[PDB]
Amino acid sequence: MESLTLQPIARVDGTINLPGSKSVSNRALLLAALAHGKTVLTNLLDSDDVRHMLNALTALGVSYTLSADRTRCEIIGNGGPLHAEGALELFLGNAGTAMRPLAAALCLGSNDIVLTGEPRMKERPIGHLVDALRLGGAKITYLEQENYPPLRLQGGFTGGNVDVDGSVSSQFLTALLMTAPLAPEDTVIRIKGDLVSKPYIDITLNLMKTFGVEIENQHYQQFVVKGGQSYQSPGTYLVEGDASSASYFLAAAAIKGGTVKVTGIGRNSMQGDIRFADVLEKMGATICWGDDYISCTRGELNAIDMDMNHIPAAAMTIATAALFAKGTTTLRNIYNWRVKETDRLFAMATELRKVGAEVEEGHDYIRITPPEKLNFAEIATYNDHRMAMCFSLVALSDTPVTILDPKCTAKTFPDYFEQLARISQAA
Ligand SMILES: C[C@](O[C@@H]1CC(C(=O)O)=C[C@@H](OP(=O)(O)O)[C@H]1O)(OP(=O)(O)O)C(=O)O
Prior knowledge:
Layout: E1 3-6, E2 11-12, E3 14-17, H1 22-34, E4 38-42, H2 48-60, E5 63-66, E6 73-76, E7 88-91, H3 96-105, E8 110-116, H4 127-135, E9 140-142, E10 151-155, E11 160-166, H5 171-179, E12 187-195, H6 199-210, E13 216-218, E14 222-225, E15 236-238, H7 243-256, E16 259-263, H8 276-283, E17 286-289, E18 293-297, E19 305-307, H9 312-321, E20 329-332, H10 344-354, E21 358-361, E22 365-369, E23 378-379, H11 385-392, E24 401-404, H12 416-423, E25 424-425
Parallel strand pairs: 3-16, 4-15, 7-8, 11-12, 19-20, 23-24
Antiparallel strand pairs: 1-24, 2-25, 4-6, 5-6, 8-10, 9-10, 12-14, 13-14, 16-18, 17-18, 20-22, 21-22
């Protein structure tokens, strides 16, 4: 068991050029692979989730080249649905943005492919997506627990009337949206009830349009898609910096700045997590917006009580930032934290108490009352990059913190600790 100990950080200040967005990167790679023509992606993220998508594309026969730092990728589009037979196994780590989208996309035409991943991925739900794909004609088999990967895909999604549950993950709808345009028949996707993580759907539609396809969005309750379309290379495409990864650095400034500026995202970003900056502002920090940067400057930090369903990833960062705020913070409507890299409500509550907070772990919310002063803890990270990054903020205090399995940040941000160190100042 590897670990990293962070000594107290007296002040943070500086500029971070953000690693590429994981959400945009994996959507762009799959759309580029399906598209006609050569796509050149720049500012692509190099992290485990992207690497698993790249390996899957290699396995499927897609040709591409990567620059030395793996942030520039020249992809030769397949000009249509990807194919493989013989129950070829694609190992997808714990990448939801590879597992959910490929589970749908590979249902086009005939195929015989198995999708699997790390143990935790076999515990992340996918039944709502499988139900929807089957309504459209796909043949899908659960090889282990019903409603979870691994899956054996045998093709057959032709389109039609498809209902999909949007209450647990927006990724199921995302996967259907990217797939349906290439199906032979038109598809009408009806959302059953609620839709969580709605901003990620806007990221999907934005990327689909960049690749030549638009659909009819009826108030997010129903989506009308014309079949028989084709994705087309947009030529060179710049991947946005990752707004979820930015959250740690902006929160660091709100706690212990200084001014921290992150570049690669700005007021025009398509990512929902730039709204994390509005939460810091509500807590008392000062935010500056640019075309290609967001900056945060220390002001004060007051507790808040907010529904965080629109920024589930960055919301975790408020849970540790809350340790430094005045008052009790409550984060609501975040049930799906439970079905991600780990059950994040259980994990966040457990680790927060270790550094001294009094915490109520609600079924779909968390309430945090900070201690007068933090104490040292060895933080468990649950194979979850975000637990490691969130708890790194404990060091913006008088106490060091030890983070177990620090390399788990590689899921989306291999260089996280060096980047936090870059803005950490002793004076
Ligand atoms: C969970 C995480 O990020 C998810 C990425 C994502 C997307 O479509 O790009 C949508 C959200 O999932 P949901 O709709 O289920 O809330 C995010 O939480 O990772 P993932 O890609 O493995 O699912 C994360 O990085 O924290």
